[PDB]
Design an enzyme around this catalytic site. Structure first.
Site, PDB file in Angstrom:
ATOM      1  N   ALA A  46     -11.271  -0.474   3.972  1.00 24.61           N
ATOM      2  CA  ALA A  46     -11.880   0.319   2.998  1.00 24.61           C
ATOM      3  C   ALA A  46     -13.229   0.806   3.420  1.00 24.61           C
ATOM      4  O   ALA A  46     -13.675   1.884   3.017  1.00 24.61           O
ATOM      5  CB  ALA A  46     -11.908  -0.513   1.707  1.00 24.61           C
ATOM      6  N   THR A 103       0.957  -1.190   0.000  1.00 27.63           N
ATOM      7  CA  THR A 103       0.000   0.000   0.000  1.00 27.63           C
ATOM      8  C   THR A 103       0.946   1.176   0.000  1.00 27.63           C
ATOM      9  O   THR A 103       1.785   1.249   0.904  1.00 27.63           O
ATOM     10  CB  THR A 103      -0.936   0.007   1.187  1.00 27.63           C
ATOM     11  OG1 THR A 103      -2.012  -0.930   1.073  1.00 27.63           O
ATOM     12  CG2 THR A 103      -1.580   1.390   1.429  1.00 27.63           C
TER      13      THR A 103
END
EC number: 3.4.25.1
Lengths: 212, 54, 233, 244, 250, 240, 242, 229, 222
Positions: free
Chosen positions: A49, A1
């Site tokens: 998320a 990420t």
């Protein structure tokens, strides 16, 4: 990420990835990690998320109410503190949160606040988040200069991701670029990291040890 | 059947009101129609009108 | 008149009447006229849409509860909004748990209990609205008349609003006619057109003002207006 | 039954002056006189009892001068029952602030909060409001001595002299002619006892119908000392001044 | 289902002074006579206790009740109001008292708790004031024997002698002269019974006349004499025979 | 506690309470604000007549709500105390949650919402209190002078009078100030405020407070010798 | 007492009858809506030259594409507008969609409705429905441009043209004839100002009239001073022929 | 979380052309201790349903109170009872299911497995499963707990699919269940010869045969075995 | 100690056309080694041409499906009988799921229906409740076997345009409903052979503007 934002003379450059892993398989190879809280402010999506989508949508809710009541654009400073208090109270839920709330006003200059699920409020000028925050930090700080064109600031951000992108395992996908002016973010378009990687490799002769 | 909870006095008013209406129309003879209209004039509430709150 | 008892809901006169209910019966007559009729296999509502003036557009008076059920408002308009939201939730709940659609009899009964409760004690107005509840279920067609008091009664036809007597005159003559008509939408609607012309005295229909709905065996709840109702005229 | 009947005290008056509060001042003036005289070096505080019954042990029972803590004493005039509740509420408030901040509560803060409770009652409390005036004689280092009085209205006003209870005007008028800005505590002791006797219909106001207290910084080594004077000590100073 | 009152029924009269406080007080005055003399070595409390109906048991009727084993109390005014107020007062004292101290409450303290409760009745909408005056007679280390009088207004003061009810005016005056600074326990009782005869004449059986003293300590009554330094019950409710005895030594 | 309806509309379409509230305002002693383009100048009468009232510890009407937001009133003196505390907590709540001190505009709406809640609820009587709210908006030096009604309405005004005898005072402001261009300096503006107040006060120099609040949290109070200085000028105008 | 509970002899709510008179005192507001734009023009009340006419507002944004005009009790109508704002944001969250003017109109009436008497199905904290009427205007695809007139009655009517406030009766009489389907935005604007001077006690100025529109292009947008003035100036030239 | 004590196991079922066949053992085993004997738990409601209950018997009583209560509530108001507000196996199934899901969300579910079997008024065959987890399905053949692993396949032979539901006659289905208990006795330690066989028929209504007993068992092969190694 | 949530397997395959959308799922219901049911549809059209499957634990899905259906009725009430957008439906499910995150529902919920231009759309939901638009995303237990196959041949991902090998990929092509049924079937067939959970039957719901079309294809029953 790998997500980052860094201030420079002409504004803020926000450059992000799009690969999302469920399990170990890339379940979605493209994912919007740019949340428009309002049209002037952008939050980065990181960690869970679902935590981030709900909580930055909710911020937007307060933003609309502030724009009506005060008839004045929503301060960067305010919007970050309201998230920080909310996440703190609910901390230890499981909420997985890591966001740089970015905006560019003429009343504070270009500004960045990093906020965490902890409830940290850190003013800054370089902030980067994720598993590959260590690689991106290396390149970025060394070619950092406040006094810099918009064009060089953009291409540094492209390069910065790309260096970090190969080595970090869960960073890949595509690069969403923005250059944030005074009158809000303006999109500077999507570029597949794969395609980008051919162009740099030839031009600069970088990644000459990598056999592509 | 129309009239419910009306005394002798009230009924009497219903018929007197009918003749004023028949006269106003200018009929030679009062119509059943006029008695019905007298019923809702002798009533405390205002005669049938278009909606405006209800 | 005021007098008697009506600031106090509990207390009644010698007779036993509560003034509050009397006012609520009057309220019906002031607002919208609506007529209902039913055959064994269909249930019809005929409502006259109304407005304040010409530039105003017309405003529904049948408010669809469900594909299988409906109601029409004639006394207080804020009151009706309350009960309809309430009744929407009760049909959902009954359909969810028992797998069985909220049959029209129970539905009037749950409704009585709510109105009665506000009039039993201090706090809370009587629901002044008179509703005419239709519904089509396994045991054919029903039409109930919701009194402001909290009394439901099964009827075959009924008329509400001022000068309702005219409409009832017609419906009783053609009571037998109407019931034995079955499988026919056209036939029913045509009678109900005439029922409401008896009521209306020195007053005009207009086809766009006339709003007609059916629910039945082969038909879910549908509202017809304009060119559609021009057919049944 | 309960719907019909009303005893609303929470009507906004048409005169701007709530009628119930009006009557509570009447009721205050039935209760005996209490006098606050503020001097540079203290507050001399003195209140006469309103009972005079012989069987009644007045000696023992203090009923008007209650010591809250070291720097703050209250004189009561008004309804004694209503008063008891506010004494416990005022005692616990000064202790809680002292615990949090390690400083005796400034006088200002304490008086304000108590006034705001009275206010609250007619604001939307539904309650009849307490029909008591309290003179809070207080000290704090910053502001020196401070003198405030409360009203059944929930309003306080500072002063250099105040009177409550009976003969508000008679007492106030004497103090204006006789008290000068600079008289010290010492003078004020002599002054207070004599004006009270002259207002009251009693030929000599006895020591046993008196309550007397002082709050002074003229207690050595930079300290604050209160002393509710005991009935017999009031008697010796009663003889000096020639009241007896 | 609560009464729709939301406000104090109790209003200031337009001349000052609560309507209801005045209203409650009348009851105490109307009700039957009670007297008490505070003494240096005790307290005598005395009341008339007339047969309601001769067929009625005149022994089960009581007007003396216990608050602590040391402190007893008698009232005048509404009988049913008293009973409840006693029960509340047992809880208000005992539990809370034990938690912050773990003893029996001194008399001064006990009397003050009662005063607040009377005020809260009155202040509270939907609840009309308790119209009873109680004399709480008791002992504590620090004040010797004490007598407080508690008015239905929620105010208390201690008295050398007091009386409430019809005969209060007559009684107080009689006593006033007879009261001395030094008093014998025996004389306090003689003088009390003498005045009580004048309140309503006849019926001087000790059955129909209820007499108690807050006499001297007994490890005998305590029911353990194994350590007799423990305080016994100070309060003693006298038998009928004992009263019969006092009439001869008067 | 109380919660029963008192917001029962007249048949003349008004809450009864709100009417009574207006009546109350008047009685409170006058307060005046006239803003310059470089100040806000505040005048008010205080009690100080009474020999043997020490003014240092007698509360002052003019109230700090923030370093750069000040508040004055006309109306119930009991209810103002409650009011002032409410504003003080709100003022601090902004620095806590949104950051930066209250914008003035925001505190004006807060104060107004309290009054409005009292009319929404039938239980709670509106305060009979109007306030003058003055200050400098954050990061800026622009003077704001705001006005309230006890009914829950707010508005900005160039000059204002509330309290006793607004008639004489209003008529003076209509001739002595004109809206096209504000007083140029602090000195010119202090003089007008002073002149206006003395009309219905009658002289004094000891009783009246004048408080000048300038930008960047400057609150400074005029000495009695300074007050009189302005009176000495004005005596000469009145003579000629 | 005369509660919400207890009705008039006819059967009407008390508060509904009283609220008519309350609105009458209020500020005149004129609404003409067309499919080329909703034009809202209102009278600004003024008592002094000393009042500052910029600060006050009578057209109030409730949402990006929603405008409103208010009349009645202003202080009650200030709360009404705060809650309406809340409702709109809350819908925007749930469906990611701009509320239909019509639904918004219903959501507001549901919130005025709730008393103080004490229900058993509902939350009480008021005493009455607000005795304020509002003109809720706005744009959405389904219905095109809209203008609604909400009553204290708990009844909403859509209008082509509606006038409320002092001038309710005389403005409406003209609006029936003059309103048409053919009208566009420039047409509508001139007409509103014309009606406004007749019912304005003093003179018509651009400094005591405030115009706004809802267009779908701009959303809710308040006109600057200059446009307003120019349409006044343009109207004068035609009046002096007579 | 309820700790299950006395257990019912096995309720076996299969569909045919006109109705449903439902059968269960009767026995309340408590692990190895057969504390309770002859525990009926095929429980009828109307002609049109038999609710065969397995799982905890302690919970089984609580479930019975709901069924009792559902018959009264339908009966209220309306007179109807001809079939109109008469229960259906659907109505009863769903009513339980909603309730069960509420208890299992609180992390305290009701610990049973329920097969509701019956015939609709139009006449369609109804056979569905709900359990502690609230996994809901209609399937042609069903067997719960231990029954699932032998009875599911056993019954599946004769009716293997949805278009065998018209084919299978009542005669084949009856035969299939008799065998099925003989098996279940042999190789399950919690299954007695005691069984109740309920025929839920649309045509004839409920024919409920209690206390059928299979009385003849196979042990012939045991005599031949004598070795060991 | 009751397990936090059970599972009921299964597999679903979501594909967005460009005017239609197809949601196909095995009709088998399976837990451990026992087939719970043969045929029990998992895809249900819930209304306004949006089909829904909450694959994974079936029990969780019964609750979710119902609450979503209750909101479909109310979308008409709130929007004055207007069409329920796919986007708007996505946000409503999201809320419930965030609410039952603290007791966490295990689902891979895919809704498919029609957008504004009338196009196919596939939105897929992670178990916590996030959702994103995707062209094609398979769900369930065998999501990972199915999904790359669709990525490679629909999108022509790394299928080089010859001569311009390495650079240009084969030009993207139109989807047609007939071509899509043929792909879906192939993907289910491969999953059948290598994953025990897939088989027996497939109930495909094709979604077009004019309604839902149900068509059933057999899969090997061994």
């Amino acid at each position: 990420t790998t997500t980052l934002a860094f201030r420079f003379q002409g504004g803020i450059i926000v450059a992000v990835d799009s690969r999302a892993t469920a399990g170990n398989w890339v379940a979605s190879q493209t994912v919007k990690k740019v949340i428009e809280i309002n049209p002037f402010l952008l939050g980065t999506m990181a960690g869970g998320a679902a935590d981030c989508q709900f909580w930055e949508t909710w911020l937007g809710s307060q933003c609309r109410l502030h724009e009506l009541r005060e008839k004045e654009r929503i301060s960067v400073a305010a919007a970050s503190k309201i998230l920080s208090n909310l996440v703190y109270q609910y901390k230890g839920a499981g909420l997985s949160m890591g966001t740089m709330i970015c905006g560019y006003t003429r009343k504070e200059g270009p500004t960045i606040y990093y906020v965490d699920s902890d409830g940290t409020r850190l003013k800054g000028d370089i902030f980067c988040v994720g598993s590959g925050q260590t690689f991106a930090y290396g390149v970025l700080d060394s070619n950092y200069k406040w006094d810099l064109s918009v064009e060089d600031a953009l291409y540094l951000g492209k390069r910065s991701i790309l260096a970090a992108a190969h080595r970090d395992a869960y960073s890949g996908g595509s690069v969403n670029l923005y250059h944030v002016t005074e009158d809000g973010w303006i999109y500077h378009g999507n570029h597949d990291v794969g395609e980008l990687f051919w162009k740099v490799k030839e031009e600069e002769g970088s990644f000459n040890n990598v056999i592509g | 059947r129309s009239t419910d909870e009306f005394n002798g006095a009230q009924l009497k008013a219903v018929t007197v009101e009918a003749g004023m209406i028949a006269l106003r129309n200018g009929q030679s003879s009062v119509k059943h129609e006029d008695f019905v209209e007298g019923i809702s004039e002798v009533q405390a509430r205002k005669s049938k009108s278009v909606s405006f709150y209800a | 008149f005021r007098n008697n008892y009506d600031g106090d809901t509990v207390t009644f006169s010698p007779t036993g009447r509560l003034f509050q209910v009397e006012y609520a019966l009057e309220a019906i007559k002031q607002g919208s006229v609506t007529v209902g009729l039913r055959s064994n296999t269909h249930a019809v509502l005929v409502a006259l849409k109304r407005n304040a003036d010409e530039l105003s557009s017309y405003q529904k008076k049948i408010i669809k509860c469900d594909e299988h059920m409906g109601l029409s408002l004639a006394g207080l308009a804020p009151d009706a909004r309350v009960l309809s939201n309430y009744l929407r939730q009760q049909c959902n709940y009954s359909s969810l748990v028992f797998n069985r659609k909220l049959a029209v009899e129970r539905a009037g009964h749950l409704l009585c209990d709510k109105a009665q409760k506000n009039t039993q004690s201090y706090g809370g107005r009587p629901y002044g609205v008179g509703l005419l509840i239709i519904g089509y279920d396994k045991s054919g067609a029903h039409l109930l008349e919701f009194q402001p008091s909290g009394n439901v009664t099964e009827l075959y036809g009924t008329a509400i609003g001022a000068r309702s007597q005219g409409a009832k005159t017609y419906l009783e003559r053609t009571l037998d006619t109407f019931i034995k008509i079955d499988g026919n939408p056209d036939e029913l609607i045509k009678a109900g057109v005439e029922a409401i012309s008896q009521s209306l005295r020195d007053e005009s229909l207009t086809v766009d003002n006339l709003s007609i709905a059916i629910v039945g065996k082969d038909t879910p709840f549908t509202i017809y207006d304009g060119e559609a109702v021009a057919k049944y005229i | 039954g309960s719907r019909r009947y009303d005893s609303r005290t929470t009507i906004f008056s048409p005169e701007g002056r709530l009628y119930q509060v009006e009557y509570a001042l009447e009721s205050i003036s039935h209760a005996g006189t209490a006098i606050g005289i503020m001097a540079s070096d203290g507050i001399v505080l003195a209140a006469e009892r309103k009972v005079t019954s012989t069987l009644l042990e007045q000696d023992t029972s203090t009923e008007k001068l209650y010591k809250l803590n070291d720097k703050i004493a209250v004189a009561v005039a008004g309804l004694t029952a209503d008063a008891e509740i506010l004494i416990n509420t005022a005692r616990i408030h000064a202790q809680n602030y002292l615990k949090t901040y390690n400083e005796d509560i400034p006088v200002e803060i304490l008086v304000r909060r108590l006034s705001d409770i009275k206010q609250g009652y007619t604001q939307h409390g539904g309650l009849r409001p307490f029909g008591v005036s309290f003179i809070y004689a207080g000290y704090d280092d910053r502001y020196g001595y401070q003198l405030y009085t409360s009203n059944p209205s929930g309003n306080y006003t500072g002063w250099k002299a105040i009177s409550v209870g009976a003969n508000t005007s008679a007492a106030q008028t004497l103090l204006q002619m006789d008290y000068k800005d600079d008289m010290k505590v010492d003078d004020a002791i002599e002054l207070a006892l004599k004006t009270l006797s002259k207002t009251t219909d009693s030929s000599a106001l006895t020591y046993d119908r008196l309550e007397f207290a002082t709050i002074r910084k003229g207690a050595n080594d930079g300290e604050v000392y209160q002393k509710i004077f005991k009935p017999q000590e009031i008697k010796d100073i009663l003889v000096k001044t020639g009241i007896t | 289902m609560t009464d729709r009152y939301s406000f104090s029924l109790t209003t200031f009269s337009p001349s000052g002074k609560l309507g209801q406080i005045d209203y409650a007080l009348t009851a105490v005055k109307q009700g039957v006579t009670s007297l008490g003399i505070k003494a240096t070595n005790g307290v005598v409390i005395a009341t008339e206790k007339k047969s309601s109906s001769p067929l009625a048991m005149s022994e089960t009727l009581s007007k003396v009740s216990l608050l602590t084993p040391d402190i007893g109390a008698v009232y005048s005014g509404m009988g049913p109001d008293y009973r409840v107020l006693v029960d509340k007062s047992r809880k208000v004292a005992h539990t809370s008292y034990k938690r912050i101290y773990g003893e029996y409450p001194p008399t001064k303290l006990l009397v003050s708790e009662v005063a607040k409760i009377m005020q809260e009745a009155t202040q509270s909408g939907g609840v009309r004031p308790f119209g009873v005056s109680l004399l709480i007679a008791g002992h504590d280390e620090f004040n010797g024997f004490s007598l407080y009088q508690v008015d239905p207004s929620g105010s208390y003061f201690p008295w050398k002698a007091t009386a409430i009810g019809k005969g209060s005016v007559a009684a107080k005056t009689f006593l006033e002269k007879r009261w001395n600074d030094e008093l014998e326990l025996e004389d306090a009782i003689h003088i009390a019974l003498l005045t009580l005869k004048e309140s309503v004449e006849g019926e001087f059986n000790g059955d129909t006349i209820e007499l108690a003293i807050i006499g001297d300590e007994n490890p005998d009554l305590l029911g353990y004499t194994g350590i007799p330094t423990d305080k016994g019950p100070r309060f003693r409710k006298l038998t009928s025979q004992e009263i019969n005895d006092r009439l001869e030594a008067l | 506690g109380y919660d029963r309806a008192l917001s029962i509309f007249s048949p003349d379409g008004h809450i009864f309470q709100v009417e009574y509230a207006l009546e109350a305002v008047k009685r409170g002693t006058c307060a005046v604000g006239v803003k310059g383009k470089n100040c806000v100048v505040l005048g008010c009468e205080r009690r100080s007549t009474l020999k043997l009232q020490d003014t240092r510890i007698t509360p002052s009407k003019v109230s700090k709500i923030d370093s750069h937001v000040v508040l004055s009133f006309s109306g119930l003196n009991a209810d103002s105390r409650i009011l002032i505390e409410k504003a003080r907590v709100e003022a601090q709540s902004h620095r806590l949650t949104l950051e930066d001190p209250v914008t003035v505009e925001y505190l004006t709406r807060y104060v107004a919402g309290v009054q409005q809640r009292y009319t929404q609820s039938g239980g709670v009587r509106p305060f009979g209190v109007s306030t003058l709210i003055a200050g400098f908006d954050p990061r800026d030096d622009e003077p704001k002078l705001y006005q309230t009604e006890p009914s829950g309405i707010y508005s900005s005004w160039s000059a204002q009078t509330i309290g006793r005898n607004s008639k004489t005072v209003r008529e003076f402001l209509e001739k002595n100030y004109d809206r096209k261009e504000p007083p140029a300096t602090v000195e010119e503006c202090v003089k007008l405020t002073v002149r206006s107040l003395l009309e219905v006060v009658q002289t004094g120099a000891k009783n009246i407070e004048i408080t000048v609040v300038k930008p960047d949290s400057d609150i400074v109070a005029l000495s009695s010798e300074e007050i009189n200085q302005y009176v000495t000028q004005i005596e000469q105008e009145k003579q000629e | 007492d005369r509660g919400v509970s207890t009705f008039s002899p006819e059967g009407r709510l008390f508060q509904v009858e009283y609220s008519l008179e309350a609105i009458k005192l209020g500020s005149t507001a004129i609404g003409i809506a067309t499919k080329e734009g909703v034009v809202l023009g209102v009278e600004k009340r003024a008592t002094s030259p000393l009042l500052e006419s910029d600060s006050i507002e009578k057209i109030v944004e409730i949402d990006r594409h929603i405008g409103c005009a208010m009349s009645g009790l202003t202080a009650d109508a200030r709360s009404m507008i705060e809650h309406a704002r809340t409702a709109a944001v809350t819908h925007n969250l749930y469906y990611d969609e701009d509320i239909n003017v019509e639904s918004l109109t219903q959501s507001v009436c549901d919130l005025a409705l709730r008393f103080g008497e004490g229900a058993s199905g509902e939350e009480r904290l008021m005493s009455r429905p607000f005795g304020v009427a509002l003109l809720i205007a706005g744009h959405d695809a389904d219905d095109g441009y809209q203008l609604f007139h909400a009553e204290p009655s708990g009844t909403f009517y859509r209008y082509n043209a509606k006038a409320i406030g002092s001038g309710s009766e005389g403005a409406q009489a003209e609006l029936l004839n003059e309103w048409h389907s053919s009208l566009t935005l420039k047409e509508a604007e001139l007409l509103v100002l014309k009606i406004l001077k007749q019912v304005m006690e003093e003179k018509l100025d651009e400094n005591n009239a405030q115009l706004s529109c809802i267009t779908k292009q701009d959303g809710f947008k308040i006109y600057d001073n200059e446009k307003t003035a120019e349409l006044i100036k343009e109207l004068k030239e035609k009046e002096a022929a007579e | 979380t309820q700790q299950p004590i006395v257990t019912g196991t096995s309720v076996i079922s299969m569909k045919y052309d006109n109705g449903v066949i439902i059968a269960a053992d009767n026995l309340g085993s408590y692990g190895s201790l057969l504390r309770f004997n002859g525990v009926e738990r095929l429980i009828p409601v109307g002609d049109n349903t038999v609710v065969g209950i397995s799982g905890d018997i302690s919970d089984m009583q609580h479930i019975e109170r709901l069924l009792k209560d559902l018959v009264t509530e339908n009966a209220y108001d309306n007179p109807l009872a001809d079939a109109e507000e008469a229960l259906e196996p659907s109505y009863i199934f769903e009513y339980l299911a909603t309730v069960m899901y509420q208890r299992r969300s609180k992390m305290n579910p009701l610990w049973n497995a329920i097969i509701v079997a019956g015939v609709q008024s139009n006449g369609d065959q109804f056979l569905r499963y709900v359990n502690l987890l609230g996994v809901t399905y209609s399937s042609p053949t069903l067997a719960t707990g231990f029954g699932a692993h032998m009875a599911n396949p056993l019954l599946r032979k004769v009716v293997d699919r949805e278009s065998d539901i018209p084919k299978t006659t009542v005669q084949v289905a009856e035969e299939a269940i008799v065998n099925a208990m003989r098996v279940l006795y042999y190789r399950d330690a919690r299954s007695s010869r005691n069984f109740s066989l309920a025929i839920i028929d649309k045509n004839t209504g409920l024919t409920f045969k209690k206390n059928l007993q299979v009385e003849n068992m196979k042990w012939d092969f045991a005599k031949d075995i004598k070795g060991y190694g | 100690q009751f397990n936090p949530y059970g599972d009921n397997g299964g597999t679903i395959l979501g594909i967005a056309g460009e005017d239609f959308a197809v949601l196909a799922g095995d009709t088998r219901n399976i837990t451990d080694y026992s087939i719970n049911s043969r045929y029990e549809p998992k895809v249900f059209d819930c209304g306004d041409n949006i089909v829904m499957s909450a694959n994974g634990f079936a029990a969780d899905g019964d609750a979710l499906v119902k609450r979503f259906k209750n909101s479909v009725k109310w979308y008409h009430f709130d929007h004055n009988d207007k069409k329920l957008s796919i986007n708007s439906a996505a946000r409503n499910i999201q809320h419930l799921l965030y609410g039952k995150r603290f007791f966490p529902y295990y689902v891979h919920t895919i809704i498919a229906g029609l957008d504004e231009d009338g196009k196919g759309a596939v939105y897929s939901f992670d178990p916590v409740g996030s959702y994103e638009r995707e062209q094609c995303r398979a769900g369930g237990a065998a999501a990972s076997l199915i999904m790359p196959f669709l990525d490679n041949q629909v999108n022509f991902k790394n299928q080089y345009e010859p001569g311009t090998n390495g650079k240009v990929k084969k030009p993207l092509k139109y989807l047609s409903v007939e071509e899509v049924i043929k792909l879906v079937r192939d993907s289910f067939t491969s999953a059948t052979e290598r994953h025990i959970q897939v088989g027996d039957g497939l109930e495909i719901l094709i979604v077009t503007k004019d309604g839902v079309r149900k068509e059933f294809y057999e899969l090997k029953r061994d």
